[PDB]
TrEMBL record, chain A:
It is found in: Nucleus. The lineage of its organism: Eukaryota, Fungi, Dikarya, Ascomycota, Saccharomycotina. Transmembrane segments: none annotated. It comes from the Eukaryota. Coiled coil: none annotated. This is RNAP II-associated protein. Belongs to the PAF1 family. The chain holds residues 7 to 47 of 393 of the full protein. It comes from Komagataella phaffii (strain GS115 / ATCC 20864) (Yeast).
TrEMBL record, chain B:
This is Component of the Paf1p complex. It comes from Komagataella phaffii (strain GS115 / ATCC 20864). It comes from the Eukaryota.
Amino acid sequence: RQDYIAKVRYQNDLPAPPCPPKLLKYEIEKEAPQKEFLKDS
Amino acid sequence: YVQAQKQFKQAEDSQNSNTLAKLGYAQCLIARNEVGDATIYLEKFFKENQDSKSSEMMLLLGIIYSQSGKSYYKAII
């Protein structure tokens, strides 16, 4: 079958890991500061 | 903490209108690391007093629910 030459290859390639910047937990995200803040007089 | 919690409970039993006594009771529960017990007491008080304007109670409820995580919607409210 001498006709138009074309190659079909589906692209589903996974991207490389992004490694985005990491959020920093608040001081009130730790159990001990939470206890100190809630137990305030 | 045990004695203060007992005193807060006695204050509540003497006069139920003392919201400050109940809030101190919840704070003492927090002091004794009774996270679940304080949460149950706070839910009972809020559901009985949904119209009460205890801003600090609602702030504490939001903080507790955020620590829980699954109850984020009540925390937002």
